[PDB]
Every structure is written in structure tokens, then in C-alpha cells.
Design a protein around this ligand. Structure first.
Ligand code: SF4
Lengths: 352, 100, 114, 110, 168, 206, 147
């Protein structure tokens, strides 16, 4: 229904300087994506907390609210209410700036996830490449948290956070190059409007590549070494007490949600009940919008579910067993996939 | 927003990089200034590309090759600095005076 | 002149996302206990106090991977416009890019054998 | 590194508090009587504790700087505080915090 | 005289001030870790300046290589060589600075005297948005030898650093 | 010498607040810090094994919001679990004090509130953790039924709700501190590495 | 409910002895204790499973005999009453001294009646008893709930 048009025209009817009107529509989706991001964090926390109890014949929170619905609310409000402590020789500027640096770009990368056509913020012609770029800023914040702490116990485990995050960006890049072949570019709308009746069937290998490189962004118990609670307590996090630890926590879960939404838009699509949709008009547009949003969230939820379900199925790996995936299983296979897709697009340019 | 001040800003980075290149005490702190110089030249190239030669961008490609070679050369430089740290066990660049 | 169309949200969103940490963190100092500075500032070495000296015994075990990452990460920037222009280019640019990739693979094998 | 004796309401160290750090010096012997406010202190009884500490370090100490010895000093202070708290100089705080009678419950001295 | 060209101006001057301040922080601050992080800040601000100049691919690449990879490499190499920075001063510590300063300053003025004297060719035509397909065409039409030859450059650099930092 | 160990008879009493908009927000504050207590995995003896069984699936304590946390700084609670000898006690005060200020304590077991069985004829046990830190809830019993720990947490949760927001002055430390020069001849640390690299392990003497 | 004023304090000042039927989670009752402390009342809970005759520990002076463990042969302490000592250690502007009992189920009818009758005598003194139960925090006078 082009809500931008009516918002600007109704607001341009009582004046308000039409350029200013186009300026004043900016913050609405820019904060709506923050709303759904925070909600996705709350949902991811509650989901992990209840499914990690289902796996174990356990029952998660039910005394917080009805079903633990208000558990991360309690967590966040507490961590606001907690004291913050700045240890003895730690720096004052870098300590309270590390978590901001590792948290910000994950939010900033929500300017590309569609949720529906013309239902996103500012489709960039670069798109996913900007995500691959902004994701490489996190190790700076992690090394900042390591250096800005007298805790050798922390820095010894903050360098290995800039060893895996600096290792699973190359195949993460190659698996999306393999999609940039097909889709005439890099914009998400172009990656997905190429699906009108999915890339997973034609990228059976790059799926594993992207999906192993996304889980291994210092997130999950298959690796999550920099928070290896048993190996060395909380790594770089153990001196962060109040809302700063909440920033780290938030950042992990919101990055997981972003990975799920991004696998959805890349390989499956944030539309397309798998029949060739649009074969069957504002009252119909508001229906297909809801349908596309719903199916997007279905696939994102399935990937969040599988991701949390590996956390309780897959014991961790030291650091050498880890880095012998990168450069020895993900990078050669990503190169092979790239060359394969290139050769097939050269021979069979149809279907790509 | 004009070409002139972009060029002036790049020249100012060039000046500052020279100052850090002559003033440096450490040896890892010199590559930082060198990278600043390379950034300045890239900035000039991108300005020329936007204003002067737009319909076929030709300086952006040259800046891509610049950031490429600068990354590689910084890599090699830090490799050399890691090796001199093995023997002399410092990076005080005023201790590397083997001539009188 | 500005032809990028698709920005003016990146700027404001860089602003609001640089403003959520400083604001959720500024909404903590307004309501929290103050400092407690005597012994809560000490460094966590598992209950015991730190030994002393406090060095790390540095190693190349994390440098070399950053080195090869710089190499193979500079490399990818030469591949995105290749993939994106592969429609327009066709043949004689795939033959001409598998050379690039093969020499890259030779570098990979060199780093692998060591 | 530090050599401390941390009982309840007696914490002894071996450095000099500059602003909240400690900085072990090997000769300053700070003290931190009752940080958690289990007791409500006056100006006199607290001075008696101070003088006990001074004439318990200097008057009887000429041996090594082990934690054994500082722990012994802390024990003598924590018994002196029983004495002050029984005789009735100082008393419990009564505030709406924990109110756990670590030293003793109130008697009547029959 | 407009809102869309005003945001560009304000953003440009903010980014330029950030660049200059952070580069002076790189060069003047005694501690070098702060200099490395401020160098990353310089790289981000320059990547934001490129977007005003219709270069988005190279901007994302600067954010992906320099700050992403090279800056991390510097933050490794710096703790590789930290030993409490115990440096005693030299008598001429000011002298060299002064020399460099005036030299550097002269260059700036000299360059400025060029930048404001020469009649640039502004070429009033709207630039092109597709600044990524065109670079793909140029890697295989015009600038192909640098592509093919930077290949072996990267090979040789790997072979060099791998055998110059090796511990033996 | 009339009422030994006496109470102090305070003045300037507390100046509590009474408006509703603040006391409802106080209820939310307390409910939030209440329903998400994050313990500290602090184990020394079989009280920790009952705490481990409390983690389990016969009856968890994940509900009413408890996450076993590994570091003190993120934590909110030390369920003191085991005996406190005289060689680990500073390794408990340095865990308690090295923690954010709104923090609580539970003392499970009898070997850590009076020394229990080791309250007599022992020469290395601390006869009560209440003379190391301010215990907030006591539950008795060598190994107690770990569902009794949840009774203690019920009883602790109805004490977090008993707090007020304009009353955080009883939450800091006063630091009544002094100094004293001395002469006690410092000795070298005999506690280092050197377990196998020591010359005497690679050396049958003459 | 989700928000409640100060009618609990009026009910308590009126009846003298209430009986809370809170849930077995102990999370939604301390707020009413706060509402009492927000007026001037001072609290002391002392956990009835541990109180004896309740005429010797509250009114009269009784003898506590601590734990000897082979050492320190039997000795008394004679702690003073819980209700004529804290009641005299009040601040100046003190409205009264409420009394909280966490586990009231373990006690019997007789001492419930005694605590109820003890509200009228010994004026500045009130009572509350947390007899666990209902899934919504409701209360009732303690003269009721018995006979
Ligand atoms: S109280 Fe019982 S369970 Fe706890 S440490 Fe002592 S003997 Fe073990």
C-alpha cells in the first residue's frame, strides 16, 4: 500500500516542507528493526532456555511469568541495576568501549534483511558484502577487551577470539560469492527475487560452508572457545559485570538471529510459500506481506532451532581441531564450489 | 563538499604521515604512518574519480590495487619486525645504528 | 552529486546504533551502586592473588594465521566484481581468472605443507 | 604480592592505600576494621582498637612476614573486639540489613 | 541552500575532523595501542568519506582489509613487542621533531599552493552508480596485467612472510 | 555490663518514601533482581554434589531464573557449598568481595555455619562462614536434600522483596583504615612453579 | 493484582494479626513488608520453627543453653525478650513493631490465639504469619482462621 507515500502525503497535506517530510519517515523503520531485533534476542534467549531443557527432560523457567516469557526482561533489568567495576590497572576508555565495538555492527547490518519486498530499510547495491565487511570489526573490540584488562587470563583467551573470527570470513565470503554469480549482483532483493518458483538445491555444498562459518562466529558450543567456561572461565568476559556483560550477551544472540535471517534470504527466501507465488489490490497486498513475513520467520526460526540444538549435541574443539576446518575443509571446499558454479554458469547459463 | 578540500585533506594526511615517519621512536609505528600516506593517495584518487573521470571510474580500480599492495607490504614489514625482535629484543629504532 | 541511492539510512542508523550502547549504559549509572573501590578492583586469578611478573610467553601461533588471512582476504576483493560481471563477461575471463585462482591455490598449498 | 588476613570485620594487608588500590610496600600494614558495618563504632572504642593494633605490631613482632603472623594479629583483634562488644562500649548496628549475630546474641550478665 | 547537500557537507567535515584528529592521535600519543585503535578509526572515517565520492565497493573493501585484517595484524605485532616501553630520551628529541614539522609543513603549503592554483576540469556529468560491474569489466579489459601479476605478488608475499617470521 | 552484646538504639531513622509510582517501580526493581539470581559455581565438598544434583533433571533450579555462572563478576549469589578450611578462606573472601555490590549468600551445610562435625577436635576448619562474610540465609544439614536448597532460595527470594530502593546506603563499605610501620623481615616466596625443572628431581645426590 | 496500595497496612492496624496465604515461591509478599516499612513500622522475622512456648521468648526472659561439644560445660545466656527489647530499641518516630513469622504451618492453634490476644495488650506491636497456600496473596484476621 506504499505506506511511505501515504505517510508523506498526509503529512504533506498540512505542510511541513515535503523534503522535511521525506526526512521524517526515516526513524520509523530504523527503530522498527530495533524492535524486532530486541524481540528476536528475547525470543532466542527464551527458546534456548526452554529447548535446552526439553533435550534433558527438564523444565525451564515457569515461575518468572507463565512460561519464562519475562526471563530475559529480568536478566536485562538486573544487569542495568548491577554495579559496574573498573579493575585496578585496566584502561577507562577501552574497557567501556570494547563491547560497544563488538555489538554495534551486528545491529548496523540489519539494513539489508528484507522481511518482505519494499519492507526493509534502504536496499543497498552492496548488501551482503557490507555485512562481510562489518563483521570483521568485532575482533578489534575483542582485542580491546583483552588489552584493557590486567587479567592475563582474559587476554590469553581474547587472542583466540581473533583467531577464529579471523578464520571463518574467507569461506563465509566464498559461499556468498557463489550466490553473487546467480543473482546479477549482491543486493538481498536481487539474491531472492531470483527465486520465483531455491539456491540450496543448486548450492548443496555452499550451504554447509556458510552455515558452519556462521555458527562459528564465537557463538555456539561446537566452538565458542572465547567463552569456554570450562577451559578458562568466560575468557574475555570475566571482568565485565553489569550492563557491559549484557552488551556481549545481546551481541551474541542478535548476531545469531541475523545469521538465521540471512541464511533465509540467501538460500531459501523471505517469501515464496514454495509454490510459484503471485499466480493467484491493497487487501491482497496486505495478505501476501503477512504471508511472506510469516514464512521468513518460519525459516529463521528453524535455523535458530538447529543452531541452538547443535549447542547441546556437539562437544567443543581445542583450537587446532578448530583451525583445521578453516584452510583445510571450508576454504578448499569453498573454492571448489566457486569454481564449480562458475563453470556451470559458463556451460549452463540457464537456471543461474 | 568540493574537490579542493578533499585534495587539501589528503595533503594534510600526507604531511602528518611524514611527521610520524620522521618522529617515530618505535619500528612498528612507522608502518602506521606509511599506511596513512597510502590512504591519502587513495583519497586523492577517489576524488579525481568522482569529479573528473566518472562515467568510467578508473581511479577506484587503482585504489583497489593500492590497498592490496599496501596490505601485502605491511604483512611483510611486520614479518621483518618480528624477526628483528628475536635478536635485538626491542623496537627502539634509534638502536639500529650500525655505522659511525 | 550523489548517485548511491540507498543511503541516508546508513548515516542515521550508524548514529542510532552508536547511541544505543551509550544510552542503555547511561541508563545504568543513574540507578546503580557507586564504586566500592578497595578490593573489588583486584584482578580475578581464581580466588588466589596473581603471582607476579605477569608475562605471556608470546607465540606466532596466532600471528601467522592473521598473515595468511590478510593475503586471502585481499584476494576476495578481486572476486566480487568478477562474480557480479560474470553475466557480461562470459568466456576468456573465466580462463583468465582461473589463473588467478590457481596461483592462489599454489599459495594455499605452500602454507598447508608447512 | 600481598599477604593478607581477611576475617570478618578485620582485613589486614601489607601495602599502602593510595586511592583504593593497595600497592604492597612490605612495610605499611593497613587495616580495614568492619567494612560491612556489622557494628556501630564510636570515636573512643575505635581508637582503642587502633592502639591495640599499634602496640600489637610494634610491641610484639620481630619475626618473618608470613600470613601466619598477620592471621594471628587478626585473631587477637577479633578477640579484642569481642571484649569491647561484651563490655558494652560498641553494639550491633540494628539496621534493616542482614542482622546475623556473628559475635554473640545479647545477654544480661547475671 | 538545500537539505540533501547540507547533510553531505556536515558529514564530510565531521569525518574530516575525525580523520585529522585520529591521525594526530596516531602520531603524537606516546602509547601505541591507542594509536592503533585510532588508526582503525581513521580507516572507518575514510571509508565513510569514499561513500560521499560515489565509491562503495572500495569503501567496503577498506573496511574489510585494512581495519579488518591489517589493523588486527598490527594489534598482534604490537603485543608481540611490548616490554613496558622503557625508552630513555635523547637530547635532540625536540630537534628532529622541529625539522620534520617545518619540512612537513612546507610540503603541505606547497601542495596547497598547487591545489588552489591549477584549473581542474570539473566535468559536469552525473556519475554512474554501478561502480562494481565496471571494475569487473576493467579487470578484464584494461587493467588485466595488474590482476594477473598481483596474483604472484600475493604468492611471493606469503612465501616471504611465512619464511621470515618462522621460529627456527 | 547490664545487657551484653547490645543493640545500639539508632536515630535519624530511615526517611523512607511513600509515593505509589516509586514503590511500584521498587517492586519491579526487586522482582527483577529476584527472579534472575545467577549463582557462582563454588564447590568444595559434597554440598556441591547436591548442588550438582540440584542442577539436574530430577529437579532443576533453572526455573525461577538461576543460571550457574562461572565468574564472580557476572554472579549474584554464593551458595557456599562445602567446608572452609583455613587455607581456602581468603580464596572465598576474594571471591565474595570481588563481586558487584548487590550480592547475596546462602550457607548450605553444617560444615560452613558452625563447622558441623568438624566444629570440634579440628585444627584447620573455619567454624562458621558467618565470620568470613555476611550470610543472608542459613539452611542446615550435612548433605541436605537439594530441594531444601530451593526452600532456602524461596526464603531468600522473600528477603530480596523485603528491600527498598532509597535504602541502598546500607550496601557500601566505610573503610575505617589505618597504617603502621613495622619490622618483620620479609621472606622469599617458596610457592612457585619448579616441580620437575627443579635440580633435585633430576639429581640422585652423591 | 499487579499493583496494590496501602490497604494492607489499614487491615493490619485494624485487626492486629493477619495471616498471609502466599504461594510456595516467596516472591510476592516482601513488598507488603516494604509498604509497612514505608510508614514507620520496623520488622523482625524470627522463623517460628525455633520458637518455644511463645510466652517465654516474647514476654518473659528465658534461658538459652548453647551447644557444648564436650568442651565448655553447660552454660546459660539468658537472652532478653524479643518484644520488650526490640520494642525499646526503636527509633524516635516509630509507629510500632510488627512481627513476621515465615513458617506458620508448623505452629498450632493455641499460639495463634496467643499471638492474636497479644496484639491488644502490649500496644505498639503487630503480628503477621505466612501460612503458605493460595496462588494469590490474600489475607485474613488471625483471630479468625481458628475457631
Ligand atoms: S556439611 Fe555435610 S555435605 Fe556439607 S561439606 Fe560438611 S559433611 Fe559435606
Amino acid at each position: 500500500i506504499d505506506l511511505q507515500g501515504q505517510f508523506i502525503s498526509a503529512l504533506q497535506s498540512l505542510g511541513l516542507s515535503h523534503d522535511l517530510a521525506k526526512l521524517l519517515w526515516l526513524p520509523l523503520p530504523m527503530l522498527m528493526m530495533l524492535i524486532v531485533a530486541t524481540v528476536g534476542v528475547l525470543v532466542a534467549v527464551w527458546l534456548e532456555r526452554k529447548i535446552s531443557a526439553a533435550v534433558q527432560q527438564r523444565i525451564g523457567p515457569e515461575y518468572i511469568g507463565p512460561l519464562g516469557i519475562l526471563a530475559p526482561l529480568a536478566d536485562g533489568l538486573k544487569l542495568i541495576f548491577k554495579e559496574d567495576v573498573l579493575p585496578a590497572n585496566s584502561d577507562r576508555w577501552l574497557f567501556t568501549l570494547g563491547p560497544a565495538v563488538v555489538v554495534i555492527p551486528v545491529f548496523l547490518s540489519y539494513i539489508i534483511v528484507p522481511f518482505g519486498q519494499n519492507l526493509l530499510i534502504s536496499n543497498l547495491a552492496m548488501g551482503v558484502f557490507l555485512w562481510i565487511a562489518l563483521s570483521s570489526i568485532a575482533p578489534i573490540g575483542l582485542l580491546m577487551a583483552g588489552y584493557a584488562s590486567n587479567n592475563k587470563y582474559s587476554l590469553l583467551g581474547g587472542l583466540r577470539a581473533a583467531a577464529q573470527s579471523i578464520s571463518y570470513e574467507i569461506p563465509l565470503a566464498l559461499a556468498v560469492l557463489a550466490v553473487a554469480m546467480m543473482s546479477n549482483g549482491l543486493g538481498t532483493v536481487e539474491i531472492v527475487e531470483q527465486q520465483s518458483q531455491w539456491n540450496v538445491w543448486r548450492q548443496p555444498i555452499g550451504f554447509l560452508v556458510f552455515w558452519i562459518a556462521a555458527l562459528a562466529e564465537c557463538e555456539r558450543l561446537p566452538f565458542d572457545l572465547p567463552e569456554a567456561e570450562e577451559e578458562l572461565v568466560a575468557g574475555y568476559q570475566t571482568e565485565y559485570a553489569g550492563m557491559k556483560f549484557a552488551l556481549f550477551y545481546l551481541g551474541a544472540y542478535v548476531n545469531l538471529v541475523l545469521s538465521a535471517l540471512l541464511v533465509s534470504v540467501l538460500y531459501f527466501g523471505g517469501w515464496s510459500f514454495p509454490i510459484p507465488l503471485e499466480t493467484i489490490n491493497p487487501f491482497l497486498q496486505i495478505a501476501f506481506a503477512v504471508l511472506g513475513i510469516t514464512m521468513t520467520l518460519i525459516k529463521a526460526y528453524f535455523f535458530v532451532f538447529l543452531a541452538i540444538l547443535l549447542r547441546w549435541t556437539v562437544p567443543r574443539v581445542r583450537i587446532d581441531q578448530l583451525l583445521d576446518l578453516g584452510w583445510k575443509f571450508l576454504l578448499p571446499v569453498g573454492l571448489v564450489n566457486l569454481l564449480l558454479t562458475a563453470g556451470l554458469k559458463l556451460a549452463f547459463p540457464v537456471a543461474f | 563538499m568540493q574537490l579542493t578540500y578533499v585534495l587539501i585533506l589528503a595533503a594534510l594526511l600526507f604531511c602528518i604521515g611524514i611527521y610520524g615517519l620522521v618522529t617515530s621512536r618505535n619500528a612498528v609505528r612507522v608502518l602506521m604512518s606509511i599506511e596513512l600516506l597510502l590512504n591519502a593517495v587513495n583519497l586523492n584518487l577517489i576524488g579525481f574519480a568522482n569529479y573528473l573521470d566518472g562515467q568510467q571510474i578508473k581511479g577506484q580500480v587503482f585504489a583497489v590495487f593500492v590497498i592490496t599492495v599496501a596490505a601485502a607490504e605491511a604483512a611483510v614489514g611486520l614479518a621483518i619486525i618480528l624477526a628483528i625482535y628475536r635478536n635485538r629484543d626491542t623496537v627502539d629504532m634509534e638502536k639500529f645504528n650500525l655505522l659511525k | 552529486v550523489f548517485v548511491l541511492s540507498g543511503y541516508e539510512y546508513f548515516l542515521g542508523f550508524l548514529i542510532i546504533c552508536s547511541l544505543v550502547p551509550v544510552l542503555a549504559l547511561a541508563a545504568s549509572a543513574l540507578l546503580r551502586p557507586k564504586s566500592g573501590r578497595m578490593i573489588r578492583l583486584t584482578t580475578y586469578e581464581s580466588g588466589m592473588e596473581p603471582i607476579g611478573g605477569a608475562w605471556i610467553q608470546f607465540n606466532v601461533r596466532y600471528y601467522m594465521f592473521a598473515l595468511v588471512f590478510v593475503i586471502f582476504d585481499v584476494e576476495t576483493v578481486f572476486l566480487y566484481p568478477w562474480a557480479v560481471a560474470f553475466h557480461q563477461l562470459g568466456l576468456l575471463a573465466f580462463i583468465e581468472a582461473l589463473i588467478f585462482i590457481a596461483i592462489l591455490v599454489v599459495a594455499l598449498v605452500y602454507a598447508w605443507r608447512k | 604480592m600481598l599477604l593478607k588476613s581477611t576475617t570478618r570485620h578485620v582485613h589486614i594487608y601489607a601495602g599502602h592505600v593510595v586511592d583504593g588500590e593497595v600497592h604492597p610496600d612490605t612495610e605499611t600494614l593497613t587495616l580495614n576494621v568492619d567494612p560491612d558495618n556489622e557494628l556501630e563504632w564510636n570515636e573512643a572504642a575505635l581508637a582503642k582498637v587502633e592502639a591495640k593494633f599499634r602496640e600489637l605490631v610494634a610491641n610484639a613482632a620481630g619475626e618473618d612476614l608470613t600470613e601466619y603472623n598477620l592471621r594471628r594479629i587478626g585473631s587477637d583483634l577479633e578477640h579484642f573486639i569481642r571484649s569491647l562488644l561484651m563490655q558494652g562500649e560498641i553494639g550491633y548496628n540494628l539496621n534493616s540489613r542482614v542482622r546475623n549475630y556473628s559475635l554473640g546474641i545479647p545477654r544480661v550478665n547475671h | 541552500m538545500d537539505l540533501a547537500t547540507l547533510t553531505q557537507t556536515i558529514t564530510f567535515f565531521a569525518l574530516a575532523a575525525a580523520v585529522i584528529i585520529a591521525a594526530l592521535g596516531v602520531v603524537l600519543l606516546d602509547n601505541v595501542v591507542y594509536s592503533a585503535f585510532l588508526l582503525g578509526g581513521v580507516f572507518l572515517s575514510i571509508a565513510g568519506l569514499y561513500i560521499l565520492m560515489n565509491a562503495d565497493f572500495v569503501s567496503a573493501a577498506q573496511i574489510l582489509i585494512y581495519v579488518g585484517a591489517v589493523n588486527v595484524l598490527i594489534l598482534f605485532a604490537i603485543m608481540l613487542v611490548n616490554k613496558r616501553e622503557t625508552y630513555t630520551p635523547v637530547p635532540g628529541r625536540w630537534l628532529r621533531q622541529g625539522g620534520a614539522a617545518v619540512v612537513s609543513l612546507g610540503v603541505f603549503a606547497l601542495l596547497t599552493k598547487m591545489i588552489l592554483q591549477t584549473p581542474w576540469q570539473l566535468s559536469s556529468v552525473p556519475p554512474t552508480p554501478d561502480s562494481i560491474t565496471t571494475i569487473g569489466q576493467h579487470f578484464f579489459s584494461d587493467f588485466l596485467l595488474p590482476f594477473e601479476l598481483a596474483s604472484v605478488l600475493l604468492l611471493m608475499a606469503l612465501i616471504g612472510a611465512v619464511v621470515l617470521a618462522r621460529r627456527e | 555490663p547490664a545487657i551484653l552484646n547490645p543493640i545500639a538504639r539508632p536515630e535519624v531513622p530511615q526517611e523512607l518514601a511513600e509515593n505509589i509510582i516509586l514503590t511500584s517501580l521498587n517492586d519491579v526493581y526487586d522482582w527483577a533482581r529476584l527472579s534472575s539470581l545467577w549463582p557462582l559455581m563454588y564447590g568444595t565438598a559434597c554440598c556441591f554434589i547436591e548442588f550438582a544434583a540440584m542442577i539436574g533433571s530430577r529437579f532443576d533450579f533453572d526455573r525461577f531464573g538461576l543460571v550457574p555462572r562461572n565468574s564472580p563478576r557476572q554472579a549474584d549469589l554464593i551458595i557456599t557449598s562445602g567446608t572452609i578450611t583455613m587455607k581456602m578462606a581468603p580464596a572465598l573472601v576474594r571471591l565474595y568481595e570481588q563481586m558487584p555490590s548487590p550480592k547475596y549468600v546462602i550457607a548450605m551445610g553444617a560444615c560452613t555455619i558452625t563447622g558441623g562435625m568438624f566444629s570440634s577436635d579440628s585444627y584447620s576448619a573455619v567454624r562458621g562462614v558467618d565470620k568470613l562474610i555476611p550470610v543472608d540465609v542459613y539452611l542446615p544439614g550435612c548433605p541436605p536434600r537439594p530441594e531444601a536448597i530451593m526452600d532456602a532460595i524461596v526464603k531468600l527470594r522473600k528477603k530480596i522483596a523485603n528491600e527498598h530502593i532509597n535504602e541502598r546506603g546500607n550496601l557500601a563499605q566505610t573503610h575505617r583504615l589505618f597504617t603502621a610501620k613495622h619490622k618483620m623481615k620479609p621472606v622469599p616466596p617458596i610457592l612457585t612453579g619448579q616441580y620437575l625443572n627443579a635440580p633435585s628431581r633430576q639429581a640422585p645426590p652423591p | 493484582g499487579l499493583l496494590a496500595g496501602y490497604q494492607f497496612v489499614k487491615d493490619l492496624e485494624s485487626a492486629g494479626a493477619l495471616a498471609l496465604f502466599v504461594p510456595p515461591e516467596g516472591g510476592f509478599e516482601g513488598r507488603y513488608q516494604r509498604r509497612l516499612r514505608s510508614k514507620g513500622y520496623t520488622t523482625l522475622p524470627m522463623s517460628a520453627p525455633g520458637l518455644g512456648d511463645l510466652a517465654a521468648y516474647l514476654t518473659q526472659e528465658h534461658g538459652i543453653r548453647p551447644a557444648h561439644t564436650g568442651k565448655e560445660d553447660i552454660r546459660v545466656y539468658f537472652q532478653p525478650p524479643l518484644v520488650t527489647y526490640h520494642l525499646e530499641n526503636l527509633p524516635p518516630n516509630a509507629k510500632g513493631l510488627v512481627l513476621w513469622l515465615i513458617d506458620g504451618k508448623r505452629l498450632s492453634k493455641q499460639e495463634f490465639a496467643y499471638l492474636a490476644q497479644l496484639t491488644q495488650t502490649l500496644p505498639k506491636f503487630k503480628v503477621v504469619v505466612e501460612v503458605g497456600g493460595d496462588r494469590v496473596v490474600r489475607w485474613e484476621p488471625l483471630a479468625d482462621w481458628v475457631a
